[PDB]
Design an enzyme around this catalytic site. Structure first.
Site, PDB file in Angstrom:
ATOM      1  N   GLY A  26      14.115  34.630 -33.132  1.00 26.68           N
ATOM      2  CA  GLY A  26      14.860  35.859 -33.335  1.00 26.68           C
ATOM      3  C   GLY A  26      14.467  36.853 -32.254  1.00 26.68           C
ATOM      4  N   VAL A  28      12.001  40.944 -31.496  1.00 29.32           N
ATOM      5  CA  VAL A  28      10.999  41.938 -31.914  1.00 29.32           C
ATOM      6  C   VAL A  28      11.571  43.339 -31.628  1.00 29.32           C
ATOM      7  CG1 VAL A  28       8.630  42.840 -31.903  1.00 29.32           C
ATOM      8  CG2 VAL A  28       9.001  40.372 -31.506  1.00 29.32           C
ATOM      9  N   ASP A 137      -2.356  29.156 -28.195  1.00 28.62           N
ATOM     10  CA  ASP A 137      -1.651  29.789 -27.072  1.00 28.62           C
ATOM     11  C   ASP A 137      -2.328  31.074 -26.591  1.00 28.62           C
ATOM     12  OD1 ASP A 137       0.328  30.082 -25.049  1.00 28.62           O
ATOM     13  OD2 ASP A 137       1.811  30.986 -26.414  1.00 28.62           O
TER      14      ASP A 137
HETATM   15  C1  LIG Z   1       5.190  47.286 -26.314  1.00 28.19           C
HETATM   16  O1  LIG Z   1       5.786  46.013 -26.535  1.00 28.19           O
HETATM   17  C2  LIG Z   1       5.453  45.274 -27.639  1.00 28.19           C
HETATM   18  C3  LIG Z   1       4.492  45.717 -28.532  1.00 28.19           C
HETATM   19  C4  LIG Z   1       4.174  44.953 -29.670  1.00 28.19           C
HETATM   20  N1  LIG Z   1       3.223  45.339 -30.542  1.00 28.19           N
HETATM   21  C5  LIG Z   1       2.858  44.578 -31.553  1.00 28.19           C
HETATM   22  C6  LIG Z   1       3.501  43.378 -31.833  1.00 28.19           C
HETATM   23  C7  LIG Z   1       4.533  42.934 -31.003  1.00 28.19           C
HETATM   24  O2  LIG Z   1       5.233  41.769 -31.200  1.00 28.19           O
HETATM   25  C8  LIG Z   1       4.777  40.811 -32.046  1.00 28.19           C
HETATM   26  C9  LIG Z   1       3.744  39.950 -31.651  1.00 28.19           C
HETATM   27  C10 LIG Z   1       3.320  38.975 -32.558  1.00 28.19           C
HETATM   28  C11 LIG Z   1       3.935  38.888 -33.825  1.00 28.19           C
HETATM   29  N2  LIG Z   1       3.555  37.930 -34.781  1.00 28.19           N
HETATM   30  C12 LIG Z   1       2.310  37.380 -34.880  1.00 28.19           C
HETATM   31  O3  LIG Z   1       1.368  37.698 -34.137  1.00 28.19           O
HETATM   32  C13 LIG Z   1       2.082  36.409 -35.955  1.00 28.19           C
HETATM   33  C14 LIG Z   1       0.798  35.845 -36.136  1.00 28.19           C
HETATM   34  C15 LIG Z   1       0.596  34.919 -37.177  1.00 28.19           C
HETATM   35  C16 LIG Z   1       1.650  34.611 -38.001  1.00 28.19           C
HETATM   36  N3  LIG Z   1       2.901  35.172 -37.855  1.00 28.19           N
HETATM   37  C17 LIG Z   1       3.941  34.791 -38.825  1.00 28.19           C
HETATM   38  C18 LIG Z   1       3.971  35.736 -40.031  1.00 28.19           C
HETATM   39  C19 LIG Z   1       3.660  37.095 -39.930  1.00 28.19           C
HETATM   40  C20 LIG Z   1       3.748  37.934 -41.038  1.00 28.19           C
HETATM   41  C21 LIG Z   1       4.182  37.426 -42.256  1.00 28.19           C
HETATM   42  C22 LIG Z   1       4.489  36.068 -42.374  1.00 28.19           C
HETATM   43  C23 LIG Z   1       4.404  35.239 -41.260  1.00 28.19           C
HETATM   44  C24 LIG Z   1       3.162  36.050 -36.848  1.00 28.19           C
HETATM   45  O4  LIG Z   1       4.298  36.521 -36.689  1.00 28.19           O
HETATM   46  N4  LIG Z   1       4.938  39.716 -34.137  1.00 28.19           N
HETATM   47  C25 LIG Z   1       5.354  40.669 -33.305  1.00 28.19           C
HETATM   48  C26 LIG Z   1       4.850  43.723 -29.866  1.00 28.19           C
HETATM   49  C27 LIG Z   1       5.867  43.318 -28.971  1.00 28.19           C
HETATM   50  C28 LIG Z   1       6.147  44.060 -27.853  1.00 28.19           C
HETATM   51  O5  LIG Z   1       7.140  43.681 -26.975  1.00 28.19           O
HETATM   52  C29 LIG Z   1       7.782  42.385 -27.007  1.00 28.19           C
END
Ligand SMILES: COc1cc2nccc(Oc3ccc(NC(=O)c4cccn(Cc5ccccc5)c4=O)nc3)c2cc1OC
Length: 257
Positions: A26, A28, A137
């Site tokens: 999807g 962010v 990763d």
């Molecule tokens: C300034 O720019 C940014 C700032 C950001 N700041 C914080 C997070 C961001 O993105 C992310 C990175 C990792 C995860 N997710 C993760 O790191 C993750 C880790 C482990 C498990 N799961 C699944 C899960 C999560 C929650 C509930 C159920 C399942 C995860 O999604 N989700 C969003 C950002 C992205 C940006 O730009 C692209």
């Protein structure tokens, strides 16, 4: 900080029109979650279950229940989840974004500050190691900055140039395999977000490593930090340190420098 329940109220969440980033999961988006007296800026991962996969809901809920227990500050933590127009994984915002692009745009960051950031990463990895979670990763693109003095590890498991020889050869992933990736990460950090093994292909890196050859000491990188990088790149998995040993070494070093 998280509310008591894993399920968040969609009415309390506001999303930005602009997407921070997209991909084969999807996208962010930057968001805002309304709490009692304040508003918390968040990063919301949005999962459009385009193929109506009945298996998704169970997978996400099992993950969210694990995420609710992961409280270390050196990780991107889950605020909560909501089942709305799409599944939305509400995570902490790391405003400054990826370490590699940050260092690239901010060449003024001092060695001391890089040492601080890499020690926080080893604290977050030590925590994941203790919890029996292997990242798989770990890379500077996967370290997000809240501030120039506050790094968080993102997208942990729950990149051939970052792989330990036993990953490419015997498909063996472990915390020790993540330590090798941490060594590459330290190289990227002290190199200000420069690309590791520049111009090489994954097959050539393997051939380089079997010669006992490693990337050189980055300009201005302290010697003890290059020595620690090189220890993370121990070919034999049995003599390579774990995260407790790496973090303690960075911890002692940081509190002297
Ligand atoms: C300034 O720019 C940014 C700032 C950001 N700041 C914080 C997070 C961001 O993105 C992310 C990175 C990792 C995860 N997710 C993760 O790191 C993750 C880790 C482990 C498990 N799961 C699944 C899960 C999560 C929650 C509930 C159920 C399942 C995860 O999604 N989700 C969003 C950002 C992205 C940006 O730009 C692209």
């Amino acid at each position: 900080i998280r509310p008591k329940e894993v399920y968040l109220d969609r009415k309390l969440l506001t999303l930005e029109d602009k997407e921070l980033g997209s991909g084969n999961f999807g996208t962010v988006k930057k968001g805002y979650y309304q709490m009692k007296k304040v508003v918390k800026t968040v990063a919301v991962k949005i999962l459009k279950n385009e193929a109506n996969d009945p298996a998704l809901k169970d997978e996400l809920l099992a993950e969210a229940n694990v995420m609710q227990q992961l409280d270390n500050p050196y990780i991107v933590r889950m605020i909560g989840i909501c089942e709305a127009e799409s599944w939305m994984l509400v995570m902490e915002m790391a405003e400054l974004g990826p370490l590699n692009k940050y260092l690239q745009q901010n060449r003024h960051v001092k060695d001391k500050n890089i040492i601080e950031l890499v020690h926080q990463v080893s604290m977050g990895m030590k925590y994941l190691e203790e919890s029996n979670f292997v990242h798989r990763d770990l890379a500077a693109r996967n370290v997000l900055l809240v501030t120039q003095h506050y790094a968080k590890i993102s997208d942990f498991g729950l990149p051939v140039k970052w792989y330990a020889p036993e990953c490419i050869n015997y498909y063996k992933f472990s915390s020790k395999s993540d330590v090798w990736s941490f060594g590459v990460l330290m190289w990227e950090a002290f190199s200000y977000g420069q690309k590791p093994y520049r111009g090489m292909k994954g097959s050539e890196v393997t051939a380089m490593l079997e010669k006992g050859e490693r990337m050189g000491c980055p300009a201005g990188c302290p010697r003890e930090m290059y020595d620690l990088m090189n220890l993370c790149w121990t070919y034999d998995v049995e003599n390579r340190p774990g995260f407790a040993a790496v973090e303690l070494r960075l911890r002692n070093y940081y509190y002297d420098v």
